[PDB]
Amino acid sequence: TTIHDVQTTGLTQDAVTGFDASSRLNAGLQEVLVDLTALHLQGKQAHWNIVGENWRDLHLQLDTLVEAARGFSDDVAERMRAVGGVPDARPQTVAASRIGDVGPDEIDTRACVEAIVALVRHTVDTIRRVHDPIDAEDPASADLLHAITLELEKQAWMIGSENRSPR
Amino acid sequence: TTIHDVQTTGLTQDAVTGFDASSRLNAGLQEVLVDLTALHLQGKQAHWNIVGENWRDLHLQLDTLVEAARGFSDDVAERMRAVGGVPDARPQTVAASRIGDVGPDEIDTRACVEAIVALVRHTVDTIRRVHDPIDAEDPASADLLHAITLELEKQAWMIGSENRSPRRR
Amino acid sequence: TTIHDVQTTGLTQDAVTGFDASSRLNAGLQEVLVDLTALHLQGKQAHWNIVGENWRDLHLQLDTLVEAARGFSDDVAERMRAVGGVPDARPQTVAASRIGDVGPDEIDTRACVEAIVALVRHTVDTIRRVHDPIDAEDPASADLLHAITLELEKQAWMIGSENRSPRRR
Amino acid sequence: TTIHDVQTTGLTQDAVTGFDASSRLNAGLQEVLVDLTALHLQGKQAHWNIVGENWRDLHLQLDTLVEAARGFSDDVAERMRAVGGVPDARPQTVAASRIGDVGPDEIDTRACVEAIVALVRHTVDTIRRVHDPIDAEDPASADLLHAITLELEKQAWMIGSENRSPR
Amino acid sequence: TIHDVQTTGLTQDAVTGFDASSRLNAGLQEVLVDLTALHLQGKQAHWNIVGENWRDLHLQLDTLVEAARGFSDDVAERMRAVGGVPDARPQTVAASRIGDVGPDEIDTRACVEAIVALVRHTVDTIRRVHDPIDAEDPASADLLHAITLELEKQAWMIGSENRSPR
Amino acid sequence: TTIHDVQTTGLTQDAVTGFDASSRLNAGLQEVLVDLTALHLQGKQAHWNIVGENWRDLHLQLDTLVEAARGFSDDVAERMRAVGGVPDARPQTVAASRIGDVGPDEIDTRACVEAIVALVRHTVDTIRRVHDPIDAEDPASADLLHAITLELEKQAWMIGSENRSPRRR
Amino acid sequence: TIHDVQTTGLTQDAVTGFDASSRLNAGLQEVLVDLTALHLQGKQAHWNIVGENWRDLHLQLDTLVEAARGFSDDVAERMRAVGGVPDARPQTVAASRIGDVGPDEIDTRACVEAIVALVRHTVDTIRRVHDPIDAEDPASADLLHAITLELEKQAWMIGSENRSPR
Amino acid sequence: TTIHDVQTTGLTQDAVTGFDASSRLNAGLQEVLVDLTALHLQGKQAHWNIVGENWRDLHLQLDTLVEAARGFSDDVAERMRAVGGVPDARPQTVAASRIGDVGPDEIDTRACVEAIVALVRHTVDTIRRVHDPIDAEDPASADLLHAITLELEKQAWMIGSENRSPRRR
Amino acid sequence: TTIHDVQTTGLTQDAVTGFDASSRLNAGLQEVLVDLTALHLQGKQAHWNIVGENWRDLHLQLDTLVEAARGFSDDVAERMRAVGGVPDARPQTVAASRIGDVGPDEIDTRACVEAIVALVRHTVDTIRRVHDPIDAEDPASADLLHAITLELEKQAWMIGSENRSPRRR
Amino acid sequence: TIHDVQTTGLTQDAVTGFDASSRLNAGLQEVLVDLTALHLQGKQAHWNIVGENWRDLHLQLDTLVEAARGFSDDVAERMRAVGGVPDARPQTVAASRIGDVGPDEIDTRACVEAIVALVRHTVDTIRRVHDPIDAEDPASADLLHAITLELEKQAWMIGSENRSPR
Amino acid sequence: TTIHDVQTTGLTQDAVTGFDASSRLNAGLQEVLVDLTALHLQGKQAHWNIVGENWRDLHLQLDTLVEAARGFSDDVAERMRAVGGVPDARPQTVAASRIGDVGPDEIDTRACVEAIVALVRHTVDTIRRVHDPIDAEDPASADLLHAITLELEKQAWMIGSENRSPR
Amino acid sequence: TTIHDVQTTGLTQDAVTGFDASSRLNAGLQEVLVDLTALHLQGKQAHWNIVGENWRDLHLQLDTLVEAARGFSDDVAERMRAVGGVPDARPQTVAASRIGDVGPDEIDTRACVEAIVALVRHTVDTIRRVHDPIDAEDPASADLLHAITLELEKQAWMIGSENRSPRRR
Ligand SMILES: [Cl-]
Ligand SMILES: [Cl-]
Ligand SMILES: [Cl-]
Ligand SMILES: [Cl-]
Ligand SMILES: [Cl-]
Ligand SMILES: [Cl-]
Ligand SMILES: [Cl-]
Ligand SMILES: [Cl-]
Ligand SMILES: [Cl-]
Ligand SMILES: [Cl-]
Ligand SMILES: [Cl-]
Ligand SMILES: [Cl-]
Ligand SMILES: [Mn+2]
Ligand SMILES: [Mn+2]
Ligand SMILES: [Mn+2]
Ligand SMILES: [Mn+2]
Ligand SMILES: [Mn+2]
Ligand SMILES: [Mn+2]
Ligand SMILES: [Mn+2]
Ligand SMILES: [Mn+2]
Ligand SMILES: [Mn+2]
Ligand SMILES: [Mn+2]
Ligand SMILES: [Mn+2]
Ligand SMILES: [Mn+2]
Ligand SMILES: [Mn+2]
Ligand SMILES: [Mn+2]
Ligand SMILES: [Mn+2]
Ligand SMILES: [Mn+2]
Ligand SMILES: [Mn+2]
Ligand SMILES: [Mn+2]
Ligand SMILES: [Mn+2]
Ligand SMILES: [Mn+2]
Ligand SMILES: [Mn+2]
Ligand SMILES: [Mn+2]
Ligand SMILES: [Mn+2]
């Protein structure tokens, strides 16, 4: 069996096409990718540069967040590839993210909790914004977005509880 | 740098709020939590007290159910936390669950199969009832419920199969 | 506690029925099962009989697809069990699948990439076709289909990429 | 070899009986079970609902306690079965435990340390109370109680040290 | 370079491997078909059993499925290593005569009987093709011994559910 | 540092003797060793030769008992070594055990449950009989017996429960 | 149902397995007795050795014990898979003639000699029963080859403690 | 909710005290701690400095002893913490241990066996001496000591056996 | 005991300083950090976007590179922290890296091999340039750089080998 | 004591093991030399391959190296267990005639050809010495079957890179 | 082949000698060993006796330090043996270490951070002092010292960050 | 992105060359490779053919040395690849090693300890001889040699210690 045998039977990538995402779908995932990638960069920045009370817990929880964002970035980027899109998470493209910035300096732990919670909440904000039209077109892509939302919001609660009083 | 620096930029928990669930959403997860917690308590009760035919399989399958329900309860409770809710699974609060009760005594294995299937189906009933309004409000929370539904119904099938005969076709 | 004790409380499979899928739902899942099982049988055929450039990578990725399809078939079949359905994946039933065939002969690796991408896409087509009415009736069953969709479409990309050149922008 | 062959040789559960615990033994273990079960329920309640300084450490240490109490509950319940007793840890039976309650609301971390230490110390109190007559009758059951005491008191120290000053 | 390699005779063409006859290959193909049929029927039963001692049987069926799947892969690849070209496509595997558990819910005790028969028919094929295979290629036969040991073990374990002391 | 250096400081096995068990203690542990070794040999016999309902669960649980008895025998024998005793678990010595025998024939699973529960209880009886004087002399040796008691009695319950019906309350 | 299964002849009764002769079964029973005797004597020595290079011998004895235990289980179950009924109760195993390390503390160098003899006597039994077993059931014999390889390996490793270069 | 709420209910460390050990109990564990800590320090000294016949076995067995003593020391120290005591295992404090000393030099393997057995037996001597009054006061603390006793005496046997001949019967 | 007790003894971070690196040392590690971080970002870009011959091997090898560079970046950043420096690997700061850029589009596998080898070699160039003055000041920091150099150059070889022919001898 | 053990005849001297002939030992020695040569050449190629589909070949060479190393150890130790004295010192292994990949960078496609030839020459040795080994010691031959299965598998996997459908 | 055959071929420990360290090298490693051993003793002392805010993080990080120092002690001691030296880390020899002491009493967590950071920094001080002449004589021994320096200084930063404000 | 795109940016192996070792460096690493490969071949010979006292410990430690030498050979050879060199470890090349030979015969364990310590020391001698010029040119390559030195010298001590008695102080 040769490439010719296969082509005449019509069992080829060109004859049997898959789901091809709309440029809207592809663009919504792209936004999520940028924000997830900025998140793990800023996350690591904070990881190294935190100082002050309850240092270790925060150092470790920032690594957990970094790990999740890295994994989710790969998942979204590859979801794009699977649906015909082309991801971009080069540093210059990622720099245009609006999730926030922890700065170049050492950061008090208490202050870092607030900044990171905001950065995570901004990344979730993007997913929730793009979710409905993605779900409408491709429910399976929205399912991936559901996993990312659950995990980020879980971590947002865990990290932020450090700075809360009872209600 | 300091907490002064962060509040001037507005990168805080107060200045940037996360998704805050309606009391309806939180109330619907609280129901699921209560029943899942009751399910694993009853599960362990039965795990210890079953007697009779095909004992070991049921002993082990009950522990598998117990483990799933424990994990799912942590998941639902923490999902509530994540959306602004405040879970309650204290024993007195869980005792108000209406899923069913295996009793305090030694229980025949065949009888236990029937009871536990009903407990699982009741817990699933709660989930399927709270589902639509939760999904309309928070699709992510409903995805969690789908995972719970899939696993519980799988277990209800595996456990119940001990007592089944081939259906009339 | 005897069987009798359990019946009089109404804690049984008979009194407390679970979700009972429509015959449409079950039929939809059965189509997906048939195509998934066809996929792993064809996958193994190819796994053995590929010859030519980048042999090892293809041999391995075909096993990864086989493993996924096998697991997903188990999941669908058991999902059917959980909802009242009776799956069939005997070889004569699976042979009616229309996803395609890799043939009885040694196959060139480049030819195999093309064919396997087609078999995978045909399997995904079935899922996408049965999806909406399944989702309407039972969102949990649709969540299983979503997991299957993500993984199959991921694999189709990875395998197919061997034969691709950058798109004309 | 059939059930009849076995019965005539006298090798049966009915002919060769094991250690049968006194209703006192069985009742002392039952008290321990209730308290261990309440402990892991309240433990999880706190696990979810803590807020404030050193959140993560406490969240994790409450899971360690929950895990130990769950295991020990199964051990005691099954020890009862092995000695002829019949355990009950249904939610309504467990609700009658007097170990204490963390309440339905969010709880400050510092406050949670105090409440949990008390809940653990109350559970240990029950074991120490029932220990002597159990040991007298069935040393092996007391040995299980020794393992539970060591572990709970270890965790009681670990959790409470958070709120201590040097002596 | 490839020409360097050709000049010293260190090639698949110059140094041929052991080549199986079409009978050796046919003997292994039969074994493959039956083993593949076995794991497909095994899974069918795994899903559809109902009744007494359900879980043990559910699990043991999966252990049989896993064994038959691995063995099928070993057999197909043995064929490949000796020049044969295996076929286990569904239509080809549907011609197996090991038996069929049907498409319906099946009583556990009935399933034990059927599956033991299916296993024993697969072992029958292996023992039938064995001697000509061992005469020609003793290493192929060693694989067959491994498959035989494991299948007959599982046949004993599964079938024991229905047995009385003799 | 030579041997001589060690002798003159009195840092030797001869100068610094350990705990030396009484002949009663050693004899008590030897009885327990004999019964434990008999237990795992009989356990394996049964493991192979059981036939009938709930075969697999019993086959597996018998291996779990075998594993436990084997480990516990090693522990007792070595406990004896640690205290000056010399254990014997050769087959001719173990054959004098009075815990019972499962016979040379295929055994019905229900008959095997009964017999094995008896063998286990007879082994526990030996431990309980030798316990108090062992505890009086050497509480550490008694703590080993406690661990053995807990596990054997746990197993007797799990195995025996197959043949039990709820007790008359 | 069970009647459904009976009508199509898919039963343990209708489809019989390979049945061993009473000689095959007797050959395996001998192997079982000796292997079981081996691990019991192995443990005895494991506890009671005293003297030079103690730890190595303590550990290697346990490795022998583990191997002989697993092999005993394989042999007993092979018997079961082919229709035999194994017996390894202590009184039955006490009739083994492989040898005995006695009930006393044993010098390590003496123990090496005794244990190697015990292993070699077990291997002797296997090689004696081999040819009639291989004639009748080549798969049974394949198990015997595995047992032989492992025991002779351990015999070499253990015995080497006492050897001089030749 | 707040720390005000907790002190009004009395659920605190101050209002509900745990078991507080007598200075005698704490003093007896402190002795065990000092000696166990000395034992692993001397153990490592010997681990590095042994020379001669059957080197590797002893090297490895010394590390096993070191590991056990380290773990047991953490156990005893933390047990003290749990009962209100305050352990001290600083080097100067541990140097007052009377269990024995392996010296600073290369040590023949046979000689090392003799010394280490004596060190282990001395550490065990401390435990057996403090035992009865600890058990009378806190049976749980004595159970810990039983575990330590069992493992140390096992190791004293395994290590010492290198130098033993069959006893005179 | 208290923080008063510790400051009178002088056992503090203020009273006993660790090695404080020169701004030159910190500046040299900062360069390495920026480039290692750029390397794994570009690595993932390529991981997703490669198309063409021997796809899977390159996909996987790029992930191995990504993993190494991530770990090494954590190592360098934390080394800076340890010597008094303050790392910066925010996206805008990393975007100033001059190692090279794989572009935003689908990239042929052969072309990707060439690009990534150059990116790796550029990152290595930075290390070898900062090395001598770092080693003169802090041999420990230079040892870290040796580990990075070894792994990166190994990967540059493995990745580049896809496109190589035997050299002219 | 050792004298106690001597009085009951439980010694390596009194109870001898299976002893291989010098031909059995010579047959295994040849297999050892070739297997050792195989893993050394395998590593050489592992380092020095250049060109298309590099990584797959790099990895599969290592899998071949690992297999040949383990098999070499099994063969040498089998010799030891039956009284032989293996030799795999570099000078001795240099006499192997399986082939040589040279000391230079080697094109991947050329390497596939060479390595398959090297594997097939090793398998050739095993099949040549097989029948006299199996006649004398069937357990030794069982080891040979394992080695044969694995090497021929790897030969197929590696060589397939260069093959066309027939 | 016998001991005699080997001796005549000259393949023996006595005929073919290895690297033999200078008493200076051996003495520099010995200093490092003492300090590493004191470090893990004091580390454990603190591990047990800490009380106060962020107890758990510090309890665990002190175990990580203890584990590293124990491993490194074994590495240095065995490096000495490999180069002809003879290590001594008996408690009385180790007591002469000047790294510092956490005392016999319970210790506030904040105070412990400062003391331990100082103890670690003092151990690193010793390694840096002895490093240059060791590196000159035996680069491989200095390489081991590089691994120990990197790890101790890493932990020194991690532990001390607890008590820092941003700069 | 095509190959062409990559060439015009100068992102290739040709435009961006890596570190290229001198022929001296490569020759130095080649000597180390030859001796390491000789070491593991001789190690295996000995592993099989040792007879006599403390057999098992020596058998095992020889495998540990073999494993180390095998891994280190791979590291050196690939280090050579990473820097432009072409390693050779074919048997005829390795046979020119001068580290020593254990012979074709059974060897007494005490004789083997002596010989293997010599082979290991000869291998270390090669490394130490080639070290300084390698370090001068490429400190990263020297760091690999340091790791090899530490482990080989560790092993020589452990193996050799079997035959040592305490030194005359
Ligand atoms: Cl990732
Ligand atoms: Cl949980
Ligand atoms: Cl599956
Ligand atoms: Cl549990
Ligand atoms: Cl498979
Ligand atoms: Cl054991
Ligand atoms: Cl076993
Ligand atoms: Cl520890
Ligand atoms: Cl990282
Ligand atoms: Cl090997
Ligand atoms: Cl250590
Ligand atoms: Cl290697
Ligand atoms: Mn913390
Ligand atoms: Mn990826
Ligand atoms: Mn979803
Ligand atoms: Mn989902
Ligand atoms: Mn949780
Ligand atoms: Mn399944
Ligand atoms: Mn349980
Ligand atoms: Mn106790
Ligand atoms: Mn105990
Ligand atoms: Mn069962
Ligand atoms: Mn395969
Ligand atoms: Mn065979
Ligand atoms: Mn043992
Ligand atoms: Mn030894
Ligand atoms: Mn078994
Ligand atoms: Mn601790
Ligand atoms: Mn980090
Ligand atoms: Mn490839
Ligand atoms: Mn070996
Ligand atoms: Mn060590
Ligand atoms: Mn270095
Ligand atoms: Mn280094
Ligand atoms: Mn390699």
With beta carbons less than 8 A apart as the criterion, state whether D117 and D160 touch.
yes
Q: Which residues of D are less than 8 Å from B119 in CB distance?
A: none
Burial class (CB within 10 angstroms; exposed 0-12, middle 13-18, buried 19+) of F168: exposed
K164 closest CB neighbour out of A52, A56, A57:
A52
d(CA L110, CA J139): 33
For residue G74, give the H/E element and its range. helix G54-81
d(CA E103, CA F5): 83
**Half-sphere exposure (Cβ direction) of E29: Cα atoms closer than 13 Å:** 17
Alpha-helical (H) ranges within chain H are 3-9, 23-49, 55-82, 91-94, 109-137, 139-160
Phi and psi at residue D54, to the nearest 5°: 50, 50
Give, as one character, the DSSP assignment of residue B102.
Answer: -
Rounded to the nearest whole angstrom, what is the distance from the C-alpha of residue D118 to the centroid of ligand 17? 22
With beta carbons less than 8 A apart as the criterion, state whether F59 and F121 touch.
no
d(CA F26, CA G47): 14
Q: Is C88 helix (H, G, I), strand (E, B) or coil?
A: coil
For residue L48, give the H/E element and its range. helix L23-49
Distances (CA, A) of C130 to C80, C95, H16: 14, 20, 62
Q: Is F50 helix (H, G, I), strand (E, B) or coil?
A: strand
C-I Cβ pairs (cutoff 8 Å, strict): 39
Helix axis angle, D139-160 relative to F139-160, nearest 10°?
100
For residue E10, give every residue at least 6 positions away whose Cβ sits within 8 Å of its Cβ, in sequence order, or none.
Answer: J99, J113, J114, J117, J118
Report CB contact under 8 Å: I165, J54. Answer: no
Q: How many CB atoms lie within 10 A of CB B103?
A: 22
Phi and psi at residue E8, to the nearest 5°: -95, 0
Against chain H, the chains showing at least 3 CB pairs within 8 Å are: A, D, F, G, K, L
Give binding residues of F as ranges.
47, 54, 57, 74, 78, 143
d(CA C153, CA C30): 20
Distances (CA, A) of G112 to G40, J81, L53: 16, 15, 11
For residue D16, give every residue at least 6 positions away whose Cβ sits within 8 Å of its Cβ, in sequence order, or none.
Answer: D10, F117, F118, F121, F122
With beta carbons less than 8 A apart as the criterion, state whether H128 and G14 touch.
no
Give the length of chain K. Answer: 167
d(CA J38, CA J61): 10
Residue E14 identity (one-letter amino acid): A
Q: How many CB atoms lie within 10 A of CB F8?
A: 10
Two tokens, residue I113: 């091999």
With beta carbons less than 8 A apart as the criterion, state whether B52 and F162 touch.
yes
Residue from K83, J73, J80 nearest L40 by CA? J73
With beta carbons less than 8 A apart as the criterion, state whether G166 and G69 touch.
no
With beta carbons less than 8 A apart as the criterion, state whether C166 and L2 touch.
yes
For residue B65, give every residue at least 6 positions away whose Cβ sits within 8 Å of its Cβ, in sequence order, or none.
Answer: B39, B40, B43, B116, B120, B155, B159
Q: With the CA atoms of L58, L64, L69 and L71 taken in that order, what torsion angle do they form, in degrees rounded to the nearest 10? A: 170
d(CA J85, CA A52): 67
Q: How many CB atoms lie within 10 A of CB L98?
A: 12
Residue I44 identity (one-letter amino acid): K
d(CA A12, CA A8): 9
Residue from H56, H61, H46, K10 nearest L53 by CA? H56
The method recorded for this entry reads X-ray
Two tokens, residue I76: 């360098």
**Would you say A163 is a known binding-site residue?**
no
Phi and psi at residue C102, to the nearest 5°: -90, -5
Residue from B34, B40, B42, B32 nearest B128 by CA? B32
Two tokens, residue K99: 């790294």
**Half-sphere exposure (Cβ direction) of G119: Cα atoms closer than 13 Å:** 33
For residue I103, give every residue at least 6 positions away whose Cβ sits within 8 Å of its Cβ, in sequence order, or none.
Answer: L1, L5
With beta carbons less than 8 A apart as the criterion, state whether A52 and A12 touch.
no
Residue G40 identity (one-letter amino acid): L
Q: What percent of chain H is helix, strand and coil (3-state, nearest 5)?
A: 70, 0, 25
Q: Is A130 helix (H, G, I), strand (E, B) or coil?
A: helix
**Would you say L59 is a known binding-site residue?**
no
A106 closest CB neighbour out of K53, K58, K166:
K166
d(CA I101, CA I123): 12
> With the C-alpha atoms ordered G151, G157, G163, G164, is the resulting torsion angle positive or negative?
positive
- Plot region of A103 (φ>0 → left; ψ -120 to 50 → alpha; else → beta): left
List the domains of chain L with CATH numbers: 9-169 (1.20.1260.10)
Concatenating the DSSP letter of every residue in B19-70 gives ----HHHHHHHHHHHHHHHHHHHHHHHHHHHEESSSHHHHHHHHHHHHHHHH
Chain centre distance of CA A71? 8
Two tokens, residue B51: 């007697």
- Residue pointed to by tokens 């009748």: G136
d(CA D64, CA L52): 52
Distances (CA, A) of A166 to D52, D104, G10: 8, 11, 68
Residue E38 identity (one-letter amino acid): L
d(CA L108, CA E70): 45
d(CA D69, CA A33): 42
With beta carbons less than 8 A apart as the criterion, state whether B83 and B141 touch.
yes
- Residue pointed to by tokens 């209100």: H84
Distances (CA, A) of G72 to B84, G59, G79, G86, K151: 61, 20, 11, 10, 51
Give the length of chain E. Answer: 166
Residue E19 identity (one-letter amino acid): D
Chain centre distance of CA B143? 14
d(CA B115, CA B99): 10
d(CA H155, CA D95): 48
Alpha-helical (H) ranges within F84-108 are 91-94
For residue H74, give the H/E element and its range. helix H55-82
Judging contact as 3 or more Cβ pairs under 8 Å, the answer for D and C is no
Task: Give buried/exposed letters for H42-51 (b at 16+ CB in 10 A, else e).
Answer: bbbbbbbbbb
For residue H103, give every residue at least 6 positions away whose Cβ sits within 8 Å of its Cβ, in sequence order, or none.
Answer: F1, F5
d(CA C117, CA C127): 16
Chain centre distance of CA D155? 13
Concatenating the DSSP letter of every residue in G125-136 gives HHHHHHHHHHHH
Distances (CA, A) of F101 to F43, F112, F151, F156, I49: 10, 11, 21, 16, 70
Report CB contact under 8 Å: D94, B41. Answer: yes
Phi and psi at residue F108, to the nearest 5°: -65, 140
For residue D71, give every residue at least 6 positions away whose Cβ sits within 8 Å of its Cβ, in sequence order, or none.
Answer: none
Residue from I147, H18, H126 nearest D155 by CA? H18
Burial class (CB within 10 angstroms; exposed 0-12, middle 13-18, buried 19+) of A1: buried
Two tokens, residue C141: 């069953």
Two tokens, residue G110: 């003496």
For β-strands F50-51 and D50-51, DSSP reports them as unpaired
d(CA L46, CA L106): 8
Rounded to the nearest whole angstrom, what is the distance from the C-alpha of residue I130 to the centroid of ligand 26? 50
For β-strands I50-51 and H107-108, DSSP reports them as unpaired
Q: Is H50 helix (H, G, I), strand (E, B) or coil?
A: strand
d(CA H74, CA H33): 8
Residue from A38, F54, L29 nearest I91 by CA? A38
With beta carbons less than 8 A apart as the criterion, state whether H107 and H46 touch.
yes
d(CA B149, CA B146): 5
Residue A52 identity (one-letter amino acid): G
- Plot region of L100 (φ>0 → left; ψ -120 to 50 → alpha; else → beta): left
Residue B69 identity (one-letter amino acid): A
d(CA F149, CA F146): 5
Give the length of chain A. Answer: 167
d(CA B151, CA G9): 38
Residue from C56, C51, C54, E11 nearest J110 by CA? E11
d(CA E80, CA H56): 48
Q: Is G4 helix (H, G, I), strand (E, B) or coil?
A: helix
Q: Is H164 helix (H, G, I), strand (E, B) or coil?
A: coil
d(CA J12, CA G113): 6
Q: Which residues hold their Cβ within 5 A of ligand 22, which is an ion?
A: B 54, 57; E 53, 56; F 54, 57
d(CA J123, CA J128): 9
Phi and psi at residue I15, to the nearest 5°: -80, -30
Query: Looking at the DSSP assignment, which residues form a beta bridge with residue F108?
Result: F51
Resolution, angstroms, 1 dp: 2.0
d(CA D72, CA I98): 60
Ligand nearest to the CA of J108: 30
Question: Which residue in chain F has the smallest CA separation from D74?
Answer: F154
Q: Is F32 helix (H, G, I), strand (E, B) or coil?
A: helix
Residue from H72, H66, H26, H30 nearest H46 by CA? H66
Question: Which residue in chain B has the smallest CA separation from K166?
Answer: B1
Q: How many CB atoms lie within 10 A of CB H117?
A: 27
d(CA D163, CA D154): 16
Residue from G97, G98, G101 nearest G49 by CA? G101
Phi and psi at residue D50, to the nearest 5°: -60, 140
Distance (Å) from the alpha carbon of L111 to chain H's nearest alpha carbon = 13
d(CA E91, CA E102): 17
For β-strands B50-51 and F107-108, DSSP reports them as unpaired
For β-strands L107-108 and L50-51, DSSP reports them as parallel
d(CA L89, CA G109): 42
Phi and psi at residue A107, to the nearest 5°: -130, 125
With beta carbons less than 8 A apart as the criterion, state whether B51 and F166 touch.
yes
d(CA L168, CA H164): 28
For β-strands E49-50 and D107-108, DSSP reports them as unpaired
For residue D61, give the H/E element and its range. helix D55-82
With beta carbons less than 8 A apart as the criterion, state whether C1 and B106 touch.
yes
Question: Which residue in chain E has the smallest CA separation from J147?
Answer: E139
Phi and psi at residue K107, to the nearest 5°: -130, 125
d(CA E105, CA C132): 28
Rounded to the nearest whole angstrom, what is the distance from the C-alpha of residue J53 to the centroid of ligand 30? 5
d(CA K26, CA K48): 33
With beta carbons less than 8 A apart as the criterion, state whether H16 and D118 touch.
yes
For residue G154, give the H/E element and its range. helix G138-159
